[PDB]
Design a protein around this ligand. Structure first.
Ligand code: BB2
Ligand code: ZN
Ligand code: ZN
Ligand code: ZN
Ligand code: ZN
Ligand code: ZN
Length: 180
């Protein structure tokens, strides 16, 4: 069973609206949470497990029997804060790579829950940091796309190692290259 790693194109592909809110959905959500707990993550998005659908799960505590198991399908940011804050992010699709990303502090979101119920929440602190990370995923935006040029530099070679890994595995050239 498998986390999709950069530079896999799955991570860049358009993700479908979810229309159907059934048990398969609940089983998917549940697989995702368990992937998160196994890999010590604090969120996951559907493309990261091979599925180009608009679905994210997160839990800010990142620990069993802690925090909240938050689910969001078909979300859309209605607004970002003006205030920006730094935070060191890693990503399960880029194993071992950690670097500063600056993002809005809070967001207003419109999203659906696991049954189909549309709602409207605000987020700040870690929940908004995780959300935005995962929402980028839903839009085929990766964390290094959001990194300043000096920060991207410090991880270039680490990204290329992932590029190489994918080339060695597939026999194909990487479909994208941080050298940009
Ligand atoms: C920070 C914003 C949300 C991060 C989400 C990722 C998981 C992921 O890639 N989701 O798309 C994660 O859990 N990353 C972890 C991460 O960045 N963490 C773990 C808790 C604190 C923070 C490191 O500052 C580790 C696994 C790299
Ligand atoms: Zn489970
Ligand atoms: Zn579980
Ligand atoms: Zn832990
Ligand atoms: Zn990620
Ligand atoms: Zn190079």
């Amino acid at each position: 069973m498998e986390i999709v790693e950069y530079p896999d194109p799955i991570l860049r592909a358009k993700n479908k609206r979810i229309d159907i809110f059934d048990e398969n959905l609940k089983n998917l959500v549940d697989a995702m949470f368990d992937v998160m707990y196994k890999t010590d993550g604090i969120g996951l998005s559907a493309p990261q497990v091979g599925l180009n659908v608009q679905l994210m799960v997160f839990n800010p505590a990142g620990e069993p029997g802690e925090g909240k198991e938050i689910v969001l399908v078909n979300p859309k940011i209605k607004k970002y804060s003006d205030k920006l804050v730094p935070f060191d992010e890693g990503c399960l699709s880029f194993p071992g790579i950690y670097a500063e990303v600056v993002r809005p502090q809070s967001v207003k979101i419109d999203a659906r829950d696991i049954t189909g119920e549309r709602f409207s929440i605000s987020l700040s602190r870690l929940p908004a940091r995780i959300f935005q990370h995962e929402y980028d995923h839903l839009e085929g935006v990766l964390f290094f796309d959001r990194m300043t040029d000096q920060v991207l530099d410090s991880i270039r070679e680490e990204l290329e190692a992932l590029e190489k890994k994918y080339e060695e595995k597939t026999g194909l050239p990487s479909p994208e290259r941080v050298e940009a």
